[PDB]
Amino acid sequence: SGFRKMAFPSGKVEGCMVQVTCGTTTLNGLWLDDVVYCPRHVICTSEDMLNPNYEDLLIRKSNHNFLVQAGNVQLRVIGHSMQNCVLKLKVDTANPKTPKYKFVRIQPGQTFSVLACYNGSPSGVYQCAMRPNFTIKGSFLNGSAGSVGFNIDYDCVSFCYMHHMELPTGVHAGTDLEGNFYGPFVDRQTAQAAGTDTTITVNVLAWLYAAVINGDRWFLNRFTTTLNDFNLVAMKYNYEPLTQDHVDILGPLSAQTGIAVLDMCASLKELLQNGMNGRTILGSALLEDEFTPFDVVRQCPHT
Amino acid sequence: SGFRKMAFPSGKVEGCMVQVTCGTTTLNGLWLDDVVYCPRHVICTSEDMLNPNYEDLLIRKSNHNFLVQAGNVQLRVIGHSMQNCVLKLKVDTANPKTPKYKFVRIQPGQTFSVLACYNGSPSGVYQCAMRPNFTIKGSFLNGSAGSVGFNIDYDCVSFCYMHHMELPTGVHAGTDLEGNFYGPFVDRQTAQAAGTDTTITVNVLAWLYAAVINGDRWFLNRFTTTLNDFNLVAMKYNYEPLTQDHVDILGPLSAQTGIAVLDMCASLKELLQNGMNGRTILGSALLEDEFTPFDVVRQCPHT
């Protein structure tokens, strides 16, 4: 038993982590085949990061203005090209450690592992959710731009995130690996703020099921509710509407436990209106919403 | 900015996991140099599990009863020996991915990263603290025995935990990498109970400083206390006595914050007596203790 925020093993990402230096800006790049992906702000000087002309600053850069470094191996930079808000540095060496990979764009609600990295050195891995407002609540320090988020399914790494910047509120923002930002953010120094956040109801329901599957059942009650009666309580406490597809998605989990989706809603609704009265669920005093239904199933096979 | 439970990059350990099968039991082994380490109860079998005699069981075993598999390469067993609660299988192949490693017995309150494996294939990685009663609160299912737990320091993997079993209360237990169980536990399927847990005081303070570094400061005050005066309140709330050594350990986090350790003790005695009163600390409604002082420094370097 047990249930922990768990991240995929990072070994396959670790051998793609490299370090990129243009002038005195240093960050991390991703090394796939003979291309190295890095935030395009590595080309910006600390005096040019307010409203920068990226198309203009890149041309000036020659290849030798880019220092790429995988561990202590130097990589020749043979070409440079703009991939939206990221940069594709062509190198002379294909990464001998390139994993089977794909780039996918996640939707809000979905989760992924993050491999915190600094100066091309990975430092730690942990599990994040793409919030409804397209930020993520991670732990990135200065120079961690270029750390990536990935899901690993069987053997194929799906890269879904590349960290770019911190919002003035402490949350983080980045692009997919095709260089397109998540949400309404730009890679300039403006007064961007995260949209107002909301809780991801399906993930809480999923995690409630994970609690039941592990023998935490004190919150279960005899009431039941209509989707719409629930969703109006959901609106009140800043929670996303639950849709029929969510209820479909919660199907498998509802059958492994034999607790109707709408019966669990009745528990969640009680918990939002009255609180937990000093109890905890799966070790937490708060409702956790960064576990997808698929994530619950990984640690709780039906068997 | 940001602060989240963070596992070490697991890539150096992934390369050591193998699957070990004896008879009809399968679980994970640790392939270092020319030896595979796994739990000794792989040689257990149905006939007797409440009082298996392991000398008798091992004596009924030859080298070719142990099947070792590393990816898609079968290792052949050259010799087998028993060391406390752990098996060492000599294989004909040295692991060409063996990291720089050491075997350490962690002390109660210390933390390590677990790399859950099933069938010698890693599955995920997360942070875990050896509870003062020598159990860990992990996420483990049948067949994950042999999953190890480690710290990483300058590319040296300090192995500290190997998973063996789950107690009736749902917490887990295992040996160090020398086969000696953390705690008063035996590797029998008999009902065994851990002592009463306690909260790890010095870890909690280390969390509180991590909250201050991240801008949650609402719990501070100007009061102060004594080690002796504070340790009284710790006893009432089932906290571990705090020692001068803990105060010295927190030294580096006190400098980074400007809050003397005993001023932070005053802060924490206030939290125990009057609850968090609806607020949260680093997005938690409870006091966390699975964060070592060093673990905070790691995620929040100062200068």
Author numbering:
A (entry chain A), B (entry chain B): 1 to 303
What does the paper say about this structure?
The main protease of SARS-CoV-2 (Mpro, also referred to as 3-chymotrypsin-like protease or 3CLpro) is responsible for the majority of nsp processing, cleaving at 11 conserved sites along the polyprotein including self-excision of Mpro by autolytic cleavage of its own N-terminal and C-terminal autoprocessing sites. SARS-CoV-2 Mpro is a functional homodimer of two symmetrically disposed protomers that are each 306 residues in length (33.8 kDa). The active site of Mpro features a Cys145-His41 catalytic dyad, which orchestrates nucleophilic attack at the carbonyl carbon of the invariant P1 glutamine and the formation of an acyl enzyme intermediate central to efficient peptide cleavage. Using C-terminally substituted Mpro chimeras, we have determined X-ray crystallographic structures of Mpro in complex with 10 of its 11 viral cleavage sites, bound at full occupancy intermolecularly in trans, within the active site of either the native enzyme and/or a catalytic mutant (C145A).
An additional structure of C12 in complex with the C145A mutant in the same isomorphous crystal form was also characterized here. For cleavage site C12, in which we have captured complexes within both native and C145A active sites, crystals belong to space group P21 with 12 protomers in the ASU, four of which create dimers with bound active site complexes. Native and C145A C12 variant crystals belong to space group P21 with six dimers in the asymmetric unit. In both, the C-terminal C12 PHTVLQ substrate sequence is clearly resolved in the equivalent active sites of four protomers. We propose these observed motions and destabilization in the WT context, are necessary to effect substrate product release which must occur efficiently post cleavage. These observations contrast with the binding of C12 to the C145A mutant active site, where the lack of the Cys145 γ-sulfur atom allows a more optimum interaction network between P1(Gln) with the oxyanion hole, S1 subsite, and His41.
